[PDB]
Amino acid sequence: TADVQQKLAELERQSGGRLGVALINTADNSQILYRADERFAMCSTSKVMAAAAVLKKSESEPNLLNQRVEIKKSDLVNYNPIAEKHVNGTMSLAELSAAALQYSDNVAMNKLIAHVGGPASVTAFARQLGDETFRLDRTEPTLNTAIPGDPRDTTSPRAMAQTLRNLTLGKALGDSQRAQLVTWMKGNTTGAASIQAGLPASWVVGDKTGSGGYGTTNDIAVIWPKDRAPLILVTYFTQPQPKAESRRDVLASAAKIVTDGL
Ligand SMILES: *C(=O)[C@@H](NC(=O)/C(=N\OC)c1csc(N)n1)[C@@H]1N[C@H](C(=O)O)[C@H](CS)CS1
């Protein structure tokens, strides 16, 4: 629609920030892009890549997901809703992926990064997927700084949508891993107010939210509307003021504007 671009434009200005958007309609492989080629701080939406990178590995390491991992009281960071229940205990990689994807647990992310060899190797996995834009550079919690102009821990809407389609729908992962990722994302607890709040209440959403400094509010989602082919929707939104508040409603409006007619 001619209007869509102009609507996202006004949405962006009224919202007073920088709005990145990339929608893939698997019905006709069409796309809606808005600043789809600019870098945005990923924030916790980065957690999908790390877990996917662990999933990839398990394909070539029968278990891997069952390996236990020590939760040291030293490990705790700023947001630890599941790990904190296992200090001086362990959690499987399967349990950390789940905890990272569905509760945005920051310790589990750090564990995931650990077991794939640091952020550079998670980036190396993105390259094995043909994603040339994704870069993980830091650990939790500092990778969420979202300091403007910084390129650390960023990607583009276009890159992340194609990648997320490859992971949840395509063949980046074996059939069993693909299904596990989708179950995990389908079970997220943090997304109710972001992409999902812009869709009909009946559609099924698997999403990973992200938030960070400068009012940065992100969400990346695979969507299965009833009686339709799925959509991949990346919405990234960032703000000038370092202490600007989150704006999850911006992401819902964006999802609102790009699905009108679907
Ligand atoms: C990841 O992007 C996730 N949050 C964090 O990583 C947090 N801090 O790291 C800098 C954090 C602070 S409070 C909190 N709940 N998380 C994003 N935060 C949102 C949110 O609504 O706060 C959800 C967690 S409910 C996941 S996204």
Q: Which amino acid is at 217?
A: T
Q: Which long-range contacts (CB under 8 A, 24 or more apart) does 173-176 make?
A: 173/52, 173/55, 173/56, 173/59, 174/59
Is residue 199 within 8 Å of 217, Cβ to Cβ?
no
d(CA 249, CA 118): 33
Solved by what technique? Answer: X-ray
Ligand 1 nearest atom to the CA of residue 142, by list position:
10
Using alpha carbons, list the distances in angstroms from residue 246 to 51, 87, 241: 25, 30, 11
44 annotated active-site = yes
- Residue span of the structural domain in which 114 resides: 2-259
State how beta strands 40-41 and 154-155 pair.
antiparallel
d(CA 115, CA 17): 36
Residue 136, C-beta contacts closer than 8 angstroms, at least 6 positions apart: 42, 46, 49, 50, 113, 119, 120, 122, 123, 126, 143, 153
Q: What is the CATH number of the domain that holds 171?
A: 3.40.710.10
Query: What is the number of domains present in the chain?
Result: 1
**Bond preceding residue 242 cis, omega within 30 of 0:** no
CA 6–ligand 1 middle distance (angstroms)? 31
CA 119–ligand 1 middle distance (angstroms)? 19
CA 189–ligand 1 middle distance (angstroms)? 11
Is residue 254 within 8 Å of 18, Cβ to Cβ?
no
Is residue 52 within 8 Å of 73, Cβ to Cβ?
no
**For residue 212, what is the DSSP state?**
E
Ligand 1: list residues with CB < 6 Å.
Answer: 43-44, 78-79, 104, 106, 141, 144, 190, 209-212
Ligand 1 nearest atom to the CA of residue 248, by list position:
21
Catalytic residue from among 15, 30, 44, 121: 44
**For residue 245, what is the DSSP state?**
P
Which among 82, 85, 92 is positioned nearest to 115, based on CA atoms?
92
